[PDB]
Every structure is written in structure tokens, then in C-alpha cells.
Amino acid sequence: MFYHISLEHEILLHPRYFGPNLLNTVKQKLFTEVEGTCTGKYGFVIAVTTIDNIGAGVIQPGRGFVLYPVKYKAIVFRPFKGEVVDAVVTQVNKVGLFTEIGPMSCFISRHSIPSEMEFDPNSNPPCYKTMDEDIVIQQDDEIRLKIVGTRVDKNDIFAIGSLMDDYLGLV
Amino acid sequence: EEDASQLIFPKEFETAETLLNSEVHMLLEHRKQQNESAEDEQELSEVFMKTLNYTARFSRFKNRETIASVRSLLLQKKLHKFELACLANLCPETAEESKALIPSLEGRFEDEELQQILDDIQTKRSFQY
Amino acid sequence: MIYICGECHTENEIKSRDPIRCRECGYRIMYKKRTKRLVVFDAR
Amino acid sequence: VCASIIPFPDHNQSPRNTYQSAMGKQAMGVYITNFHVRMDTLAHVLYYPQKPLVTTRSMEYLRFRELPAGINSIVAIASYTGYNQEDSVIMNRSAVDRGFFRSVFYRSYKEQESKKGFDQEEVFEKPTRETCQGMRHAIYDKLDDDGLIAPGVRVSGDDVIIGKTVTLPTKRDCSTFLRTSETGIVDQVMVTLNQEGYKFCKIRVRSVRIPQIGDKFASRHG
Amino acid sequence: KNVTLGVPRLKELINISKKPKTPSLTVFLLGQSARDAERAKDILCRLE
Amino acid sequence: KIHS
Amino acid sequence: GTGCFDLLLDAEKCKYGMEIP
Amino acid sequence: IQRRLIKSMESVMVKYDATVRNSINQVVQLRYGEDGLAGESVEFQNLATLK
Amino acid sequence: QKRITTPYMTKYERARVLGTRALQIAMCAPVMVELEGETDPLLIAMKELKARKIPIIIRRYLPDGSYEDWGVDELIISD
Amino acid sequence: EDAPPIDLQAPPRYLLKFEQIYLSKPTHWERDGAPSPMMPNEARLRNLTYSAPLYVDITKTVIKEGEEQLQTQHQKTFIGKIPIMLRSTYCLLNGLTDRDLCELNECPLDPGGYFIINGSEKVLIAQEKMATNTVYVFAKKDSKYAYTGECRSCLENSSRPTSTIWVSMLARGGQGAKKSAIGQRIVATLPYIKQEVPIIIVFRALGFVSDRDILEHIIYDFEDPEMMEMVKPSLDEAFVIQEQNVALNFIGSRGAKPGVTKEKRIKYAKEVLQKEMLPHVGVSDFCETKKAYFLGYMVHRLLLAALGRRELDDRDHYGNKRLDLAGPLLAFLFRGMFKNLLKEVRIYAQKFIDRGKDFNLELAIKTRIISDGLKYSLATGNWGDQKKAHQARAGVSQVLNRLTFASTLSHLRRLNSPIGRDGKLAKPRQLHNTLWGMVCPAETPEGHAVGLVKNLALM
Amino acid sequence: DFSARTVITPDPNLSIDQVGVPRSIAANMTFAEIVTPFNIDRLQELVRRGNSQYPGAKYIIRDNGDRIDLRFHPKPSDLHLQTGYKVERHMCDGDIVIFNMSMMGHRVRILPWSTFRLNLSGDEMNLHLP
Amino acid sequence: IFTVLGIEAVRKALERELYHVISFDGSYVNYRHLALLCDTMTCRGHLMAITRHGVN
Ligand SMILES: [Zn+2]
């Protein structure tokens, strides 16, 4: 889910960037540290809108690196537990559907998929189709799923979804 | 210890205001425009590109006027901010669809009034064709 | 291996890492004649 | 098109006519004449697709007579041994042995060796146990010197039918095995160049299915 | 009188939605008027 | 179905 | 242990200055 | 409807005191079926002391 | 403003300011004053203090929790 | 031909116009680049789109303020390529005898009519849409107003995006001091006006200041007094607006982007009514009389329905629904890339023009947008461009079912019910009487999507 | 151990409790059983059969919890089992299976053909083995 | 009925409506099962909508 937040990040600036208008270097540095990363607590930081203010630069003793506490406005993608959201299928395997909820990738287990669905390896491309053939989930298909739980791994958020709940599928 | 169905989540997100998938695309477009031309900077991160396609593909509104109208329409009600973007993003077809997908709405919304809200969203969302 | 052009149906030997094209046609589709290893068939 | 082929639809119930429209599409038979040249992921062709004894005039325009999708049967409506419920049917084993409803199955496997990365690229060759580090337990004698199985070789169970390896920065095996465990014989092999110019090949694995107790048979209506 | 039954009513029974489809009410009369037909018309008018 |  | 005061960098005073290289 | 009904009565069970209680241990019914008898063994009959 | 601390600069502040600046100078930091061949980083910072050019701003934390921003140039050094 | 002129400025004026389009038969371009013919069968085997090159003539006139106009001719510019439906006029298998088709490994009995994209045969499922340039009066019990004067109006095949105006009539349920007196009044919502403005004011903006002229265009029979009384309340709201300029000012007040100055409001309203409103009846600036007559007819149609003398239009009536085939569908798509094509040329030249040097056209025209743009949707099935912030219409251009010949024929003639508000409000699943002889009644997939997907009748 | 779904066919000969299952499906499915002196020989012969033969064991679990694959059969001593071990012998006749929250148990009977047999008294199903 | 006669009267009314629809087609259900559903809904003193989650 997308939100508007005001976060705090301590920027480490080398003394080499102590030239004229050093605040510009701090401002542009913030567009690389917190931009494009994925904090485990607030989720993926997809983009930064604007900068609120830049705090006083405190010089760390011994290290010699000036620390600049800067406040900025950014939009994060935090998948809340037990939240239903649309997803895009990227690949399909016998284990289960592999979905893509925006920046992150969510995996759907075979058990979570309704029993009526049955994986078909012969059909090109693979797609979880039930016997009645009423609903089929191909690749790059807009499907709605509920995230039962989310886990944070290697500075990234991995989500597990399910379609057992009512009205979860192609619609 | 947090669950979206029961409206329990970290206290920090309470101050945050939700955004629509189509609306976020506009914000990403504004970010994309300045980076591309305003400043000579490294190319945008792969994460930014991935979400841009997700918002564009699932964008339910054409222009800001449609986005603003839906935002204003839903703001008049007691809809919680979490449901504000969730309802608009999901675009439930009928009232029964939304309550099952959004357990919170069932708490303070009747089967009739909410139906009059979802159908209003339908009149605002438009297709490419 | 020996292949067959999809247009003239003539034998053309194509080696590994060689462009796939018929000399007599320039056709870009080639087939395989058959395998010399025969199989057993039961009338069932 | 699907409703036209039905005799006496007026004598038939509306849901049954609607039900046939779905069943008619699911019926297997000769779909076109140039099936051998083309390569399709799924293609079921009947051994003896014969024109029906009871045919509609509009059937001529649909050309379904030329390419029917079923075989007529002398059906006796009776309860024999109680092995047929409302949703069931009893067949004749001797008839099947003579070709009563037998049909072929075609599954096309596609693969291309492309130079996606400058350092790592895909190639077609025999994945030898020595040169290759990572591999899956399977029989590799089927593949030829070019990494492609020649037509006329019987393939059963888990078997490699096309050889592909990636030169990771020693190579890792990434070949494609059979989708299922069915026993089939490769029909034809095609080697081409894709739009990107990289080598691209297609092979059609042909298998023979004999009607059995688990196959589902449907009349023209019901 | 058209009384909704089947799934539509079963849905409206488990669901406590304040407004059903056809919320009919059965009125039972008592006394002498309960037997006569004309004497039951005035009640009909005073309820309708 | 079974071969799958 | 010498922590009653902290050194802070100022951008205004950094506007002047030339790199040695 | 079938799934909804099961969830709302999944935890309903008969305890060892011949009472119907849920997971929270709230008494739904003092006796199962108001009689305390299984619904399978019961047989239909018409007592003839009232007609 | 309204600063109550002594105008002079303590020896501890002088040592840390020069030490931190000298470390910064050794890290390819710009030098405000003109360079006349002084290789050793400490000498570069020492003359910077003399000329009152060090950008470092001293934030003296009072025991009550308040802080005062005293510039090195503003403070009266002893030479 | 209908493309807007391309103008570039930053003294140096560049005007680029497309003269004519030349289409050649399908060919395959290998690394050598020779224009070798590309058989349809080869496309499936090689897993490449079956398509033909597209060529356009571009003529540019450049003036550098020197009072000297000179132009150059670009013959058959490689604008891009267009997928070709099999067995079509531009297909390689048109007018060929059955003997020749076998030589090319193509089934003579195969009817064709599909597109081969990346080796996959795709059939453009016809999508039913509400008919354009038609007046429909429907009754909805959920809206605040009793009746809807819905009429989506569009020009010829496609010049501008479709614009719809709803001439609604307020319901009598509401009660008020003045509302109850006048009672039921007609309100018309303009496409670019957020609020509902009275219909009477619209005529005043057109130029019919006199109130009698308003009744003349709406009420054709003055002898009938039933219809006359219904229009009386509508005049009360618009009565204070007597002058045409005031009416133009009134409409522009609630415009989407109101002008800062007073005169700008009139101009915006003038453009909206002239161009945005009722494009089909007139697009020029001298169609005020024609536009008013159609507007009056919409009110007149509403009056008949409100009084009950005219039956309400049937939602499921197929006469009110139009079917969009591969032609009409691809026509809408072609504009998406072409409109973006002009932007790419404009943006590319913009940096060149401001620098003063001429820009070569070979770099300006983008082949990928035209080629990949059509190929993208036809393959994935998501109609339209992916970059645009919208929801693509899925389910179109599905994989052709080649399991049986009858199935293939049914899929090509397959139809799809409308989606969105139109389909939601109506009952597409239910079988209507209009389907007799036009859409097969028996044929319909079984499941949740029952009746939404149908098949064309044989004849 | 969920099985591969297969079509359903009727079989009045089988009892209503009994269910027919093909050899191939039962071969993949395994039922861990604790070996006891009263049936030490029964597990000794079944493990000897191997996975090539249908009446075999996919894996054998020792007391320490180590699982040894029987496909390879590296040493005869490893094949030998001691009391208290767990052997994942393939499903055989007389085993109890459960399938379609109320589920009905069934007694599996091995039949030659592929499709499942049920004494109904069509739709695909998967049977779970406790 | 809840706002006029009270929750207790609804239990009988809910039983009658549930039985009326079930018996309309001729099917019959044991009273004990029907009573259980009504009691659970009215166990908390006010009408409770059946759990819409329906996970199981
Ligand atoms: Zn050749």
C-alpha cells in the first residue's frame, strides 16, 4: 500500500564534499541512500517527493564524518498483513502462482489456491485453470489476493498470499 | 501482531495519508520528469520503474479531476483513511464485494449506503477504449 | 547434422555454430530427416 | 456454428443445446489439414474421424463434414452390470482394440539459445557429465551431437529432449525435460532463427492415447 | 403477495441489513370482524 | 491428469 | 569525557575555499 | 453461505457438562438441542395423547 | 545571541577543532586560506584558526540542556 | 490525412504534413535487410509476427523568415508496420486457388481472419458498445433525477474522442420552497462542465436569445399543451439569463479550468459548446442552428418519455449496441501510436529547433512505437498502450482455439458483451428477442460468464 | 501427502467404504509405519523389494531421525532395519484414506487401471493418507 | 421485531423465517441445528451478522 510519510535519515557526508554549497551535495546524496532501497520497517521507498528540512551537521569525533539529520517526504510501499490487493502474475510453476505486487514479488502456494484449480503443464503458457475452465490465471494476469503474512529477508520484504477467501481470483 | 483486517498496524502510519494507484503515478511522473531533464543524475532505480508500471496498469482514473472528485466524495463520509485508498484501488463491483474484501467496512457501513458509493466510483473510473 | 529445407526439400549439411539457411533458397527453416535408431511398435 | 451441428435441437432442451456448445469445442478431432507442418502446444487428432450418419444441411457450410470430430457408435441404452451411473458409460474393449476412439496427442517444445549477456550465453550441445557441473539425474543418450533429439526416438518418463547450457562465470545445465511422464515418440524437429537472429528450434513430441476407463466421452447432446 | 424466498431471503436472514427486499407483515384479526369480509375492509383501509 |  | 561541546559544520563559511589539488 | 455459517459455528461444541459453548467458553445453549440428544439417533413419531 | 558563555575559546575546544579540521584536510577537504607549501595537515588548520576561516561551529551544551552556537571566528583565540 | 499539422518554433518555422500512405505486401527483414516475402506459415514456425511494412509520404515546408519557402519530398518514409489479418486484401493468400494454398503449407479449408503475433494466432473478439449519435432515455431509481437524456455523440469513423452528454430531468421526489412550485426542471451536464447547467441556458449560449425560439426547437406541436407545461419550469431557472453573453459567462463559470479574466469564461464556453458538445452535428463555428435543433430534439425525446407517450429505450436492444471488429478496434489503437508518434517527432525536433540546425526526419520517426505498439496489445491482450495511466480492456485478442475446426469457426465469430457501466446496468446474460437470426441463442459458455460471450449467427 | 488428482468412475463391486486407487498413485504415496517384532519380516521383505517394484518403501527412518533413500541401495547392511524404526512403505491394500469440513474415510484397494474407483451409493479428487 | 419485541422474540421469529424458507421446497432440517444458529446470533443480546470472513 502507498502512503505519504515524513522519515528521518542520518546522512554521512565525507569531508571531500565540504566545498561551496555543500548543502546541495547533501540534498543530492539523499536521492541515492533512501531512494530505491527497501527498509524492512516501512517497506520499499519507491520515490521521494520533496525535502522537509536539513538539520545541523554534527561532526562525529574521531571518525571525522559529519552527520546530517535530514527530514524528507517520500512514498513507501508497506504490505500490511491480512490485506487484499491486486497483483500481477510473473510466472507459474507446479509449486504455485508467482505474483508481483508492485515493487515486491508475492508467492502463492498450491494449497492456498482453491482445490478446483489444477496446474496444467501442457498448455502453453502455463496457467492454473480449473476443470470447468470458467476461470484461468495466465501470466501477467490481474488477480486479487490476500496477503496472509509477510517476512523480511536480506533487506527485502517477501509476501505470501492466498485465494481461499471469497471473491479472490481474476475478478 | 499487525493485521489490516482488524485495522491494527504501527502507530507511525496513522499520521500518513493514503494515496491512490493512479494518483501515485502522477507523483512518480513528477519525480520522473525532474530527474530526466531538470538535473543530470544517474538513471532512476529499478524499484521506481517497477512501481511505475504497476500504477499505470492499475490506474483507474484519467486525470486529477477524476481523482480529486473521488477523493472528495469519499472524504465526506466516515471512511477510514486506510479504506480510502483500498476501496478506490480495489474498485469493488458491488457492496457485497467490498465488505468481504474489506472487513472493516462491514462494521460501520450498511448494505445500501455503500452500494451508492461503489457505483459512484464506477461512474468516475474509465477504460482506455 | 543433415537437415532438410522447408521450401525445396533438399538435403543440406549444417554444422554446429553455423547459420541456418538453405543455399538453394535462403530459407531459414530446416528440419531433421529421421533417426537411424529404430523403435519397436506393437499393434495395440 | 456449434448449435447448427445439433440435430433436432427443438426436440432437445435449451440447457442441453447450450451444454453441447461447450462440449463441441472441447471435442477432439481433425482441426485442419496442414497439422503436420505446423507446431502447436496442444493438438488432438482423431484416428478415424468419419462424417455422421445424421447430418444437418447447415453442416455442409461449416465444412464439419470434411473435418468431423467424432466417431459414430452403435449405442444400446441399457443398465449392464450396474457399472454406469447417470454420469458414466460402458464401452466395448474389443472395439477400442480395433480403433474405436483412439487419437493422437501433439505437444510442441520450443527453446532458443540467445546471447542475453556478454559474459553468459546459451548454447545447444550435449551436456556431458564432466564439462557440466550442475545437472539433474536423467538419461542423455537420446540427444545427438547437436543437442537436439532426432525424430523417431521413443521418449518415456523424465528424459531430456533438447540440450541447453549456460556459461555462468564450467556450465550449468538448464535443459528442458518432458512436461509429463507420458511415453511418446518425437514426430518432427525444426531448427530456425528467431526474430532476434539467435538460433531457435521447435520439436513436436507425439504420443498415442488409447481410450480407457478414465476417458470422458460425450454425445452430441447431453 | 410476492414474498421473496430461497437464497435472496436466506441471504437477508443471516445478514442483518436494515432494509430487506419485501419486508411483508402478516396481520391477524380477532373478534367478529375476523370472520366477516366487509368488516375486515375498514381495517385494511386504516392500515394501508 | 494422472501423468501430471 | 570531553563531551560537553559538539563541533558543527557550517555551509556559509564553506562557500569560500579552493581545493589543494 | 456454507463457508460463512461454518466459521461462525466452527468453535461451537458440546462440553463435558452437557452444555454448548464456543472457544471463548460462552454458553450458547444449556443443553444441546434443548434436550441433550443427538440428531442422528432421534426418530420421527407421533404421540397419540393429544389429538 | 543571548550567549552567556565566555567569549574566549578553551584549550580543549582549540585542540578538538584543529584535530577535526586537520583530519578533514587530510580527507581532501577544501582550505579557505592560501596554501604556501604547508604539507602537514595540522599546520594548514593552525593558520586557518589564526585567519578565522574554520567553518566548524562549536555547540556548547549547557548542563541544563540548552546549547549555544559559538563560531570559531567569533571566539577570541590566544596566539 | 486528418492528423493535425506539426508546428515547431523556438524565426525558423517547420510545417510537416503526411501526404499519402503506401502499403506493401508482407515481407521479412533479416540482417541483410532484403525485402524477401514472408509466408504466413513461416511466421508461426519462426515465432514472429505476421505483418506488412507501413510507408508514409512526409512533406516539410521550412521558412527562416527570409521570404523564401522551399520544401523537400520524402518518398515512402519507413513509418513502421501493420499486422495483416490472414486472407485479407493485403494478405499473401488472397484470391489464390486451393492448389496454391497447399504449396504454401496452408489449409485451403482454413477461413483465416486472425493475426499471427509472435507465432500465436489471435482473434479480435468483437466488443459490443452503445451506439453513437443516438438518443436514449432510460429510467434509473437510484439517481437523484427521474430520467436520463443520455446521448453519446461522435463524428465520422473517429476524429475526436467520444463525448457524451446526459440531459437529465430532476425528479419530483425532492421538496423545497421554490423547487416544489416549478417542480420538475431539465438540467443538462456538459462534457467539460462539472456541474449540471440548465438546458435552456445552453440554447441562449448558442445564440437563440429569444425565449420563443427555445420553445420552437423543443416543442414542435404548439397545439399540444401537455408538453408545454413541462418545459415551463425549466425556463424559470434560465430566465434571469437573458443575454447570450451572460449565458456564455454562466456556463464558463463552472468550467473545468475557469479563466482568470471575465472575457476568458465566454471564450471557454464558446469552444466547449462549439467543439466539445455535439461534435457529430457540427464541428465548425457556423453550425449553431444545426446544433440547437439536435439539442432540442434530445429535450423533445425526453418530454415524450416523461409523459409516457414514448416507450423507454431498451438497454439490451442490439439496435442500440454496435459491434467493434478488428477494423474498428485497430483503428482506435492506430491513433494511440500515431498521436505519440507526433510527440516523439516534436520532442526530438524541439531540442534541435531551438539550437537553430535542421533535424533529419529519419531519426525523428520512431518505428518501434508503431510496430511494438500494435504487437503489444495483440499479444498480451491488454488493449491500448501500457504507459498511459489507465486500465486496459483485457480479454481481447485471445489465443485461437485450434482443438477443433468447429471451435475455430465459433471463436472467430465470437462476440463479447459490453463491460463497465453499460454492461453492469443492463442484463447481457439474459437472452433477448433481438438475437433472433443475429446471435445464436443456444451457444453460450457455461459458468459465471454465462451469456456474456456469444457467437454470431451463421447468416 | 496429497496425491495427483484423477477422474472418478463408479464400481458397484467395491464396498461403499472401499476406494479404488491405481498402482502408480499408490507408489508415489507413502505411509510411515513403526516396525515391530510381530511384523519385522513384513517390513524386511518390502524394503528389499525396492522402488522399482510397486510394493516397496520410498524411505527408511532410523531412531536418530536420519532418512535413507531406498532407490540407491548402497549397502545391504543399511537396508537391514532394527526394532523401533519408521519405514515409509508404499500404500497397499487395507490402508485407510480420507477425502471429500467433514471428510469420509475409505479403505484403499489397488486396481490395475488408472482412474479412481468409488462405489457411489466424474469430478476429479485427491485422497489424503494419514 | 428486535426494536419492538426484543432479541428474545427475534430468536423465535428467526427460527420461523429460517424454517419457512427451508420448508418451502419440502426439505426439512432438525430443529436443534436451526436453534443453534439463532442462539449464536442472539447470544450477545443483539442481532449479529454471520461472520463474513468465511475462511473455512
Ligand atoms: Zn531449399
What DSSP line would sit under A57-108, residue for residue?
A: EEEPTTT-PEEEEEEEEEEEE---TTEEEEEEEEEE-SS-EEEEETTEEEEE
**CA-to-CA distance for A8 and A54, rounded, in angstroms?**
10
- Phi, psi (5° rounding) for residue K82? -115, 165
Contacts of D107 in chain A (CB under 8 A): 122
- CA-nearest of J123, J42, J39 to J330 is J123
Contact status, residue J248 vs residue J270, Cβ threshold 8 Å? yes
8 A C-beta contact, residue J377 and residue J124:
no
**Cβ K106 vs Cβ K98: under 8 Å:** yes
**∠ at Cα J120 (J408, J42), nearest 5°?**
105
- Establish if A58 touches chain G: CB-CB under 8 angstroms: yes
How far apart, in whole angstroms, are the C-alpha atoms of residue K46 and residue K89?
7
Domain coverage including residue I20: 1-79
- The C-alpha R_g of chain K, in whole angstroms, comes to 16
Neighbours of ion ligand 1 (CB under 5 A): C 5, 7-8, 22, 24-25
Asked if B128 has any chain A CB less than 8 Å from its own CB, the reply is no
Q: For chain G, what is the total number of helices (H) and then of strands (E)? A: 0, 1
DSSP state of B38: I
Distance (Å) from the alpha carbon of B112 to chain E's nearest alpha carbon: 8
Residue G4 main-chain phi, psi, to 5 deg: -75, -10
Element (H, E) at B75: helix B64-75
- N residues, chain F: 4
Given a contact cutoff of 8 angstroms between Cβ atoms, the answer to whether J406 and D1 are in contact is yes
Residues J436 and A46: their CA atoms lie apart, in Å, by: 55
| Residue A164: domain span | 81-171
Annotate J79-116 with DSSP letters as a single string: EEEEE--TTSTTSTTSS--HHHHHHTT--TT-----EE
Residue J417 to residue J427: CA distance in whole angstroms: 10
Q: How far apart are CA B10 and CA J245, in angstroms?
A: 58
Helix (H, G, I), strand (E, B) or coil at D148: strand
The alpha carbon of residue C25 and the mean position of all alpha carbons in its chain are separated, in whole angstroms, by 15
- Chain A contact for B43 (CB, 8 A cutoff): no
CB pairs under 8 A between C and D: 53
Contacts of G4 in chain I (CB under 8 A): 60-61
Distance CA J60, CA J94 (A): 36
CA-based radius of gyration for chain G:
13
Residue K34, φ and ψ in degrees, nearest 5: -80, 125
CA distance J220 to J272: 27
Contacts of L12 (CB under 8 A, 6+ apart): none
- Long-range (24+ apart) CB contacts under 8 A made by A88-93 are A88/A140, A88/A141, A88/A142, A88/B54, A88/B57, A89/A137, A89/A138, A89/A139, A89/A140, A89/A141, A89/A143, A90/A139, A90/A140, A91/A139, A92/A119, A92/A125, A92/A126, A92/A127, A92/A128, A92/A137, A92/A138, A92/A139, A93/A126
Closest CA to J53 of J41, J72, J38: J38
CA pair distance J224, A148, nearest whole angstrom: 68
Q: How far is the CA of D125 from the centre of ligand 1 (A)?
A: 25
Distance CA J122, CA J139 (A): 39
Ligand 1 centroid – CA C29 distance (Å): 9
Note whether A46 and B63 are within 8 A (CB).
Answer: no
Strands in K57-61's sheet, in edge-to-edge order, are K30-34, K86-90, K57-61, K67-69
Cβ-contact J246, J133 below 8 angstroms: no
Contact check, Cβ <8 Å, G8/A59:
yes
A125 touches chain B (CB under 8 A): no
Number of Cβ within 10 Å of residue C25's Cβ equals: 14
How many angstroms does the Cα of residue K82 sit away from the middle of ligand 1? 69
- Cell 494515496 appears where? B19
Q: Which residue of B has its CA nearest to J328?
A: B129
First to last CA, chain H: 39
Do you find a cis peptide bond into A15, omega within 30 degrees of 0? no
Distance CA J37, CA J48 (A): 14
Q: Which residues of L touch B (CB under 8 A)?
A: 49, 52-54
If 0-12 CB within 10 Å is exposed, 13-18 middle and 19+ buried, where does residue K54 land?
Answer: middle
Interface with chain L: mutation pick from H6, H7, H14, H35, highest number of L CBs within 10 Å: H7
Test A142 with J394 for CB contact under 8 angstroms. yes
C25 is in an annotated binding site: yes
Closest CA to G11 of A17, I69, A10: A17
From chain G, pick out residues whose CB is under 8 angstroms from the CB of A22: 9, 11, 14
SS3 string, A117-142, reads EECCCCCCCCCEEECCCCCEECCCCE
Smallest CA-to-CA distance from J337 within J381, J398, J388, J396 is with: J388
Amino acid at D25: K
Closest-CA residue of chain K to F3: K4
Are J428 and D93 in contact, with CB atoms under 8 Å apart? Answer: no
Question: Chain C within 8 Å of J45 (Cβ-Cβ)?
Answer: yes
Strand partners, B8: B3
Residue I72: CA count within 13 A, CB half-sphere: 29
- How far is residue D40's CA from residue J45's CA, in Å, rounded to a whole number? 10
Q: Could you give the number of structural domains in chain I?
A: 1
Q: Which amino acid is at I26?
A: A
Residue with cell 503489444: J376
Residues whose CB falls within 8 Å of the CB of residue J358, separated by 6 or more in sequence, listed in order: J62, J352
* Length in residues, chain B: 129
Q: How many CB atoms lie within 10 A of CB A126?
A: 19
Starting at the edge strand found earlier in the chain, the sheet holding J13-23 runs: J6-8, J13-23, J51-63, J70-83
> Under an 8 A CB cutoff, do J45 and D192 touch?
yes
Residue recorded with cell 416507450: J311
| One domain for residues A56 and A7 | yes
Residue appearing with cell numbers 554446429: C16
- Co-location of A120 and A97 in the same domain: yes
CA of D204 to the centre of ligand 1 (A): 22
CB < 8 Å from B in window 171-230 of J: 194
Least Cα distance to B61 among B76, B50, B73 occurs for: B73
L55 vs A: CB within 8 A: yes
Q: Is C13 annotated for ligand binding?
A: no
- Give the C-alpha separation, J53 to L51, whole Å: 60
Q: Are B56 and J386 in contact (CB under 8 A)?
A: yes
**B93 - beta bridge partners?**
none
Angle (nearest 5°) at CA C29 between C28 and C35? 140
Q: Given CB atoms, is B65 within the 8 Å cutoff of chain E?
A: no
In Å, how far is H43's CA from the nearest CA of chain L? 11
**Closest chain L residue to the Cα of B6, Cα to Cα:** L53
D→A contacts (Cβ < 8 Å), by residue, are 41-42, 107-108, 179-180
Choose the final residue of a domain: A47, A80, A113.
Answer: A80
CATH number at J223 reads 3.90.1110.10
Give whole-number Cα distances, J410 to B16, J458, K106, in Å. Answer: 53, 10, 44
State the smallest CA–CA distance between residue A143 and chain I in angstroms. 54
Partners of K86 in beta bridges: K34, K61
CA distance B95 to B111: 6
Helix and strand totals (H; E) in chain J? 14, 18
Whether C9 and chain D come into contact, CB under 8 Å, resolves to no
Q: J26 alpha carbon to ligand 1 midpoint, in Å?
A: 20
C22 is in an annotated binding site: yes
Which chain D positions have a beta carbon within 8 Å of F1's beta carbon? 214
Give yes or no: residues A56 and A93 share one domain: no
Nearby residues of J439 by Cβ (< 8 Å), 6 or more positions away: J318, J415, J454, J455, J456, J457
- Chains E and G contact (Cβ–Cβ under 8 Å for 3 or more pairs): no
Comparing alpha-carbon positions, the chain L residue that sits nearest to E9 is L21
Do the strands A104-108 and A156-162 form a parallel or antiparallel pair, or are they unpaired?
parallel
Q: Nearest chain J Cα to B61, which residue?
A: J390
DSSP state of E40: G
Q: What method did the depositors use to determine the structure?
A: cryo-EM
List subunits contacting chain J, requiring 3 or more Cβ pairs under 8 Å: A, B, C, D
Residues of B with Cβ-Cβ distance to A5 under 8 angstroms: 12-13, 15-16
Tell me the C-alpha to C-alpha distance, in Å, between residue J141 and each of B70, B111, D4, J144: 22, 17, 41, 8
Number of domains forming the structure of chain B: 1
Beta bridge partners of J150: J136, J166
Range(s) of the domain holding residue J151? 138-321
Q: Which of residues 1-4 of F touch A (CB under 8 A)?
A: 1, 4
C7 known ligand binder: no
Active site residues of D: 87
Q: Determine, for residues H10 and L56 on separate chains, whether the beta-carbon distance falls below 8 Å.
A: yes
Strand partners, J59: J17, J73
| CB-based contacts of L19, cutoff 8 Å, min separation 6 | L29, L34
Distance D103 CA to ligand 1 centre (A): 33
Q: What b/e sequence results for J76-99 when a residue is b if at least 16 CB atoms lie within 10 Å of its CB, and e otherwise?
A: ebebbbbbbbbbbeebbbeeeeee
Give the resolution value in Å.
3.5
Please check whether residue J154 is in contact with residue J281, taking contact to mean a CB–CB distance below 8 angstroms. no
The bridge status of strand J414-416 relative to strand J126-130 is parallel
The number of folded domains in chain A is: 2
Strands of the sheet with K104-111, listed across from one edge? K8-10, K116-118, K18-22, K104-111, K96-99
Contacts of L36 in chain H (CB under 8 A): 9, 12, 20, 28-29, 33
The count of other CB atoms within 10 Å of the CB of residue B95 is 22
Residue J116 to residue J51: CA distance in whole angstroms = 8
